[PDB]
Amino acid sequence: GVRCSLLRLQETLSAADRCGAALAGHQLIRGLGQECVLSSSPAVLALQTSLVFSRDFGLLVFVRKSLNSIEFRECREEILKFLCIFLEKMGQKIAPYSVEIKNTCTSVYTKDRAAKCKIPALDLLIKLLQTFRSSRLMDEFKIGELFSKFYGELALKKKIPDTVLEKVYELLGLLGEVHPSEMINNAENLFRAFLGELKTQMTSAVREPKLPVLAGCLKGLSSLLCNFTKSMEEDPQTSREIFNFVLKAIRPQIDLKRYAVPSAGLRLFALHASQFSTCLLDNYVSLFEVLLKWCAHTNVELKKAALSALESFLKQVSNMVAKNAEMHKNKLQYFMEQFYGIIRNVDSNNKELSIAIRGYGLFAGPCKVINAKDVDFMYVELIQRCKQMFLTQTDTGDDRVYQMPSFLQSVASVLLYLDTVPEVYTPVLEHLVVMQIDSFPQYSPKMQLVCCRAIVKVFLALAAKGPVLRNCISTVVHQG
Amino acid sequence: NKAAVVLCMDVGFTMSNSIPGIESPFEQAKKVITMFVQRQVFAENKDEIALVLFGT
Amino acid sequence: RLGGHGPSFPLKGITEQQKEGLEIVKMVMISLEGEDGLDEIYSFSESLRKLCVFKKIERHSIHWPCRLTIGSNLSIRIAAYKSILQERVKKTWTVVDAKTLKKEDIQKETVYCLNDDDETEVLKEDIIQGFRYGSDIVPFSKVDEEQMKYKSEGKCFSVLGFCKSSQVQRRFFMGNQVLKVFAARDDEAAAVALSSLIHALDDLDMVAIVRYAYDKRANPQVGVAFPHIKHNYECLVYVQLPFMEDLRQYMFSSLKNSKKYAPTEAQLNAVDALIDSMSLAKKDEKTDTLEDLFPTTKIPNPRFQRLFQCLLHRALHPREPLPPIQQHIWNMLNPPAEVTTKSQIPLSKIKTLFPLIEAKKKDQVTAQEIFQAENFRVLVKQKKASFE
Amino acid sequence: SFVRYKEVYAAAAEVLGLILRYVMERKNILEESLCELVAKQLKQHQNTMEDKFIVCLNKVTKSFPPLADRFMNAVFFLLPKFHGVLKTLCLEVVLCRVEGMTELYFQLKSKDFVQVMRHRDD
Amino acid sequence: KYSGRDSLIFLVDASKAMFESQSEDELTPFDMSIQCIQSVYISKIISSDRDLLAVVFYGTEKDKNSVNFKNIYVLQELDNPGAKRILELDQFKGQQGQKRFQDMMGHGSDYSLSEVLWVCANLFSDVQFKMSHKRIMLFTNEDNPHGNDSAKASRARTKAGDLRDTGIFLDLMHLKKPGGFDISLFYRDIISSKLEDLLRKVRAKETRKRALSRLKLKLNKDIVISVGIYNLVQKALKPPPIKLYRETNEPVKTKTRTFNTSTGGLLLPSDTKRSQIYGSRQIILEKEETEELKRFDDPGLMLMGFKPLVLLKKHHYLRPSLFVYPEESLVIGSSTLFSALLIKCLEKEVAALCRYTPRRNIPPYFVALVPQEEELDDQKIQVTPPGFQLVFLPFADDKRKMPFTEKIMATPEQVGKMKAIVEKLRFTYRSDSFENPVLQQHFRNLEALALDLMEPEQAVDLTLPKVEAMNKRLGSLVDEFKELVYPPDY
DNA sequence: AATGTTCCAGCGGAATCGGCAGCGGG
DNA sequence: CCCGCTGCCGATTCCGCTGGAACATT
């Protein structure tokens, strides 16, 4: 089982009519992968880890020697897929075998012709550059000529079948993002490549779009914009155009079947809403509706990024109105009243009303500079609703446990932006964050993070306004 | 080796009579002469053109 | 409106002065030239429907000279003139550099990388061509096949025979052009020689299977030479014809011997009325000769005319996007209004009367089209937009 | 013979096999009558579409073994041509008839039986 | 069937007299069968170079097969025809060939029976392709192989029925006892002679059938019909010349690439425009601008009414005629009404004029669907299929202008003499058989450049007229035609 | 200086077909 | 909120055909 199947794999290389023997080797590779994945003991996991990668004989050297084999593709493809599985099956100690894998990845890409193996020879290499994002054990991967060749392999005939090209754009972006240190100079060429190709995809009265290419271009551009920001004040052309492309990639189609361009466009928007500063105040209404739409999409990963993009959008426009809210009276009123629309409307949703409350809390602070009274007009109806909902009524049996952290972050946010505390609800304030504590184990990850955000946020808010109410942080911690 | 075409175009008010219900004969003449000249100029031949205007 | 293969004046488009002007001009130009002048007259609608503005300006193709050889003795010097062949755009869309607009400021290349671990470049002079033969390749290279290739024995218009029963049917012409052989100059006896040949070939149903090569370099083609049938000249038209490898046999299931597709006589007469509604031919002026409604063999190519006007617009106006296709083009490429008006009804009679146009699950959308309490009661009593 | 949905042809075959077994156990003169019909319906399967042929033969032979004697040859010609579950159906079809095939060793060996016992499927 | 390759297993007898000259000084029938198989491979590897071929000899002392039955030697298993396999099969020609077969396999044995056909079955069985047709060519002279044993005859009969069950058709090509036919014998049940058809006249062809298009023909605006547009006449031409390395003999994968924006570097699709410089002015467009300006319609035919089959003359054609035929795929019921108006266009002698647009973004081009009735007989000669026939109509400058200034009349007496000349010159034109000189010579050259047989065959230029033959058939009269009106006379 | 052949790129039936979602299952 | 097939649905490949641009003889 261990190191003997690999031995048979290298033994069956020279057998004549390596077609049935090809299937036997492929089955052996499948069994090896199944065995290694089934392995649960970390000690034997590292043992087989060292076992598979050996210079004298192994699958790595097999791929390095089976290069000139047309029929050895499905076996090569199976080995590459197993390598992709392994690179995340185990930890971050691939190092002694990393660089050669990367090298062989390029080899198993730069010679193999079938796109069924050109994809894994990009999946494995993207995985390698993601799991060694740290500079250590990584400068052995020369980003220089890697970028050079994977950027020169798209200056040629319209050959590569729009899926390998998708992964190529993803990898160019990732090179822009992981290790941004050597490619300080050629990122302009990569930006111009991304914008030009995305242009051709979104402006043509010919040729129904290569949607995988559009998704790859957008996600790669997102990654490249990390560490290579173009804020919307220095060069006011490329940021306009990137945001225009993001709009068109998230413009609401009446009837589209595949959701891959909206996913990557929404993830770009979520990551980099701050990047598009002044472009993000013109059609904000339509952005609001489209973000609610894709929050209500009933997909699996389209909502996961639509909600993040909506959150970042509201966050950025809140941080924006909170600067010069003189001509932002109308926009402020619109946002807060649409949050009222989300929260007073009778909807059977869960993550819907958890948007209005958080937007309420974010937009609270910009209200202190328009009224200085609505920080108190709010935060009272907010605590009053908290008391009605999850202090007295259906305190035990209901579904209203999901939407407590939103209340708590909103409360803390308006709390910081509110001087001369009403000081009659503070007992209920502490009685509310204690009971946010009480219900932490009946939640899920990625709100447990946000619930911890709410708890530290309330703490850091009430604790920064003199010792009188910082005396209640002791009481709340004690009661929790 | 080369041929010369010398067109003539009437432009007068009667030629440019306001639309009797379909379209103007003068503008039809304009369309046809534009077809002729565009094909001649895009054929790169040495078939010269001399244009004159009457009813001016 | 623009051109419709039909009438010119809408209801009454003539006046007395216009009629007399037409009379005097036609009389003067007839006396100057003759009946050919009256033959050469058109409107602004068909001159946009025809190439009539382009006459006697372009030149004859080539008087390609060869000889009709029957056996080794019956020789007839001939000049073939090239007849129908597809025309094409004579300019290449030249690649340039973006935003600097210079043709020389770009240069492509071609590098023959090997199937090795990288782009292990090799030079041009160390690459010879192969050929597929089985599972491997044959190092044929170049000079070798330029020696042991077929040799053509020069340009040859030698007749391979004749045939009465026309197995040479139009569904087998295989060509890319049509040739038309008349005569030569220089004491035209060969004129009447081949004229005798074709006046023998025309009256009785025989054809002329012939061998033809353009020159020494060109490959030889066996074709059929149907005899010319016109009054002002008498030619021997020539057309290429398949070789044993060219023509394919495709078994298609029969229709007369088909059951589940059996058409009812109701359908037959329905499409009878459909055909007679949209017939493009008729008889008139008591001449017992058919007229040519929608004669698709005289109107120009919309391709290069639309290209001409598109490039005109983009050349004068470097900013505006591509224009739309003219209305007169779309009138070129549409049947006359009379047939459509006579047509709408049997069209719908078929629409209902025939089985359904069932399956429709296809879309070809372009990129630009896919990404571009008491207080409340007191208030109610006080104010109300509606009433009652 | 309705090859567009699984249950129509598969269950027609299975109920037909049940009917055939019943009219065999009842010694009546009707079994051969549509035994020939079902045989013919399989014969149109043998050489235009193989997977439906083996599915329907397995379904008839789950309850009626004595209809593969006149199909064993076919199944062997198809036995090394299947890799998925169709090979499992093929081998069950051969298994319903083995106790009486004259040698069956040569046909199996010719078809790589030893090498196919070594696969992973249970 | 499309992804379906037909196949041949060659079962060549070598027992007692097919091996031996048998008092005949022309060719031993074992060598005759070897020549036959050689011809088959030559024909296929260049006409049908995707099929499966196999040669197996039986009745031999040695025995190679998957199951190890005696006397059966599977020379080659089913695989694509190669130059190497025909070279390997070449070494059994002549007396030296007979002795080479002896020293490697060796004639003469208790030649086995049905087991032999058994091997053929397995050779078909143990392949992983899709076989449209399966057949076994059986080259033998022994035609009464059971004057002594009756059990083996019955076992052979059972196994032959066993083989015809699974779609395997025996068709034995026929060696001879005297050299020609005298053996009128009785294996008519085992089978479902003239090997000369199978030795020479398969020199070069190609095999396929495919649709070239699946378009809609639209009548008014919404009653669209599902038509396919095949071509029955192609102009096949010499295969592509792959580039090989001079030393390693490998197909280098060339890569083209543009650069040098005055900085060298590397240009990218969007870094370039397209231009034309007419007269003294350049015009600049985007790639998509040019690709779009040649857009008029979605693919498919639009009916433009009907016209008689007397107005479209025959001196107008532009392209090889296509052939449309209804497939009931895009819209159902297409075949029914398609046949309906085909019958109507027949009886009315009318044809469906249309505006063809074959591909997505292509200029329109006027076409005419000339109706076409099929043809068949008791012999089932599918000479023509039933449907329409897309004749492409020239537009306006396709039609060139000839001088037309030729007017000299003729003498209607010698015209009959020329008539008689062409009446003795006539013969059946053809339905087939005009092998392409250049292509045939090319295939010869590839053969005798990968078969090593240093003399390349000489393609007989069938196209070249036999001028001397028809001159001696003519007689000495055309000289009188020359002297009649145009004597040399200085 | 025109024309036919060679060459290259781009679009398409057709076959696989993997897998993208979507209706059953616990 | 999960798990299993079961279509049908995009892309892939590999032929194949056409168009367009190159390229060598007179």
Short mmCIF file of N, CA, C and O in Angstrom, two decimals, chain B residues 7-17 24-30 33 51-56, chain C residues 44:
data_model
loop_
_atom_site.label_atom_id
_atom_site.label_comp_id
_atom_site.label_asym_id
_atom_site.label_seq_id
_atom_site.Cartn_x
_atom_site.Cartn_y
_atom_site.Cartn_z
N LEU B 7 -19.79 63.45 -64.09
CA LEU B 7 -21.16 63.49 -63.61
C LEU B 7 -21.70 64.92 -63.65
O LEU B 7 -20.95 65.89 -63.65
N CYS B 8 -23.03 65.03 -63.68
CA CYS B 8 -23.70 66.32 -63.52
C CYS B 8 -24.88 66.15 -62.58
O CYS B 8 -25.61 65.16 -62.66
N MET B 9 -25.06 67.12 -61.69
CA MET B 9 -26.12 67.07 -60.69
C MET B 9 -26.96 68.33 -60.75
O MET B 9 -26.42 69.44 -60.64
N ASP B 10 -28.26 68.17 -60.93
CA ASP B 10 -29.20 69.27 -60.76
C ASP B 10 -29.51 69.43 -59.28
O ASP B 10 -29.78 68.45 -58.58
N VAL B 11 -29.48 70.67 -58.80
CA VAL B 11 -29.73 70.97 -57.40
C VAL B 11 -30.94 71.88 -57.21
O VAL B 11 -31.36 72.08 -56.07
N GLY B 12 -31.53 72.38 -58.29
CA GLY B 12 -32.54 73.42 -58.25
C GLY B 12 -33.74 73.18 -57.35
O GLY B 12 -33.95 72.07 -56.86
N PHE B 13 -34.53 74.23 -57.13
CA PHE B 13 -35.68 74.14 -56.24
C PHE B 13 -36.66 73.07 -56.70
O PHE B 13 -37.20 72.31 -55.88
N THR B 14 -36.90 72.99 -58.01
CA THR B 14 -37.75 71.91 -58.53
C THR B 14 -37.10 70.55 -58.29
O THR B 14 -37.79 69.59 -57.92
N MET B 15 -35.79 70.45 -58.50
CA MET B 15 -35.08 69.22 -58.14
C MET B 15 -35.23 68.92 -56.66
O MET B 15 -35.47 67.77 -56.27
N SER B 16 -35.12 69.95 -55.81
CA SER B 16 -35.27 69.80 -54.37
C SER B 16 -36.69 70.07 -53.91
O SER B 16 -36.90 70.60 -52.81
N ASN B 17 -37.68 69.73 -54.74
CA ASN B 17 -39.08 69.94 -54.38
C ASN B 17 -39.42 69.23 -53.08
O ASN B 17 -39.01 68.09 -52.85
N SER B 24 -37.51 62.81 -51.73
CA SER B 24 -37.16 63.81 -52.74
C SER B 24 -36.31 63.19 -53.85
O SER B 24 -35.35 62.46 -53.55
N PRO B 25 -36.62 63.45 -55.12
CA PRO B 25 -35.75 62.97 -56.20
C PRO B 25 -34.32 63.50 -56.12
O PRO B 25 -33.39 62.78 -56.50
N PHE B 26 -34.13 64.73 -55.65
CA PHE B 26 -32.77 65.26 -55.51
C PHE B 26 -31.97 64.45 -54.50
O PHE B 26 -30.79 64.16 -54.73
N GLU B 27 -32.58 64.09 -53.37
CA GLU B 27 -31.83 63.32 -52.39
C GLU B 27 -31.60 61.89 -52.87
O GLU B 27 -30.59 61.28 -52.50
N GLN B 28 -32.50 61.34 -53.69
CA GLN B 28 -32.21 60.07 -54.36
C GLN B 28 -31.01 60.19 -55.28
O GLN B 28 -30.16 59.29 -55.33
N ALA B 29 -30.94 61.27 -56.05
CA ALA B 29 -29.77 61.50 -56.89
C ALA B 29 -28.51 61.60 -56.05
O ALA B 29 -27.45 61.08 -56.42
N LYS B 30 -28.61 62.27 -54.90
CA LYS B 30 -27.49 62.36 -53.97
C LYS B 30 -27.07 60.98 -53.49
O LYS B 30 -25.87 60.67 -53.44
N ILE B 33 -25.37 59.07 -56.49
CA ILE B 33 -24.05 59.61 -56.79
C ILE B 33 -23.08 59.29 -55.67
O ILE B 33 -21.88 59.07 -55.92
N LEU B 51 -16.90 66.48 -61.40
CA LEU B 51 -18.23 66.79 -60.90
C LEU B 51 -18.60 68.22 -61.28
O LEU B 51 -17.80 69.14 -61.10
N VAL B 52 -19.80 68.39 -61.82
CA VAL B 52 -20.33 69.71 -62.14
C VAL B 52 -21.70 69.84 -61.48
O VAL B 52 -22.36 68.84 -61.17
N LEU B 53 -22.13 71.08 -61.27
CA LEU B 53 -23.41 71.36 -60.63
C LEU B 53 -24.16 72.39 -61.47
O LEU B 53 -23.59 73.42 -61.85
N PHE B 54 -25.42 72.10 -61.75
CA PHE B 54 -26.29 73.01 -62.48
C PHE B 54 -27.61 73.15 -61.75
O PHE B 54 -28.00 72.29 -60.95
N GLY B 55 -28.30 74.26 -62.02
CA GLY B 55 -29.40 74.68 -61.18
C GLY B 55 -28.95 75.36 -59.91
O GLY B 55 -29.65 75.29 -58.90
N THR B 56 -27.81 76.03 -59.94
CA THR B 56 -27.15 76.54 -58.75
C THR B 56 -27.58 77.98 -58.47
O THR B 56 -28.43 78.55 -59.16
N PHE C 44 -33.84 56.38 -60.09
CA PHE C 44 -33.00 56.48 -58.91
C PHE C 44 -33.23 55.33 -57.94
O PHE C 44 -32.51 55.21 -56.95
#
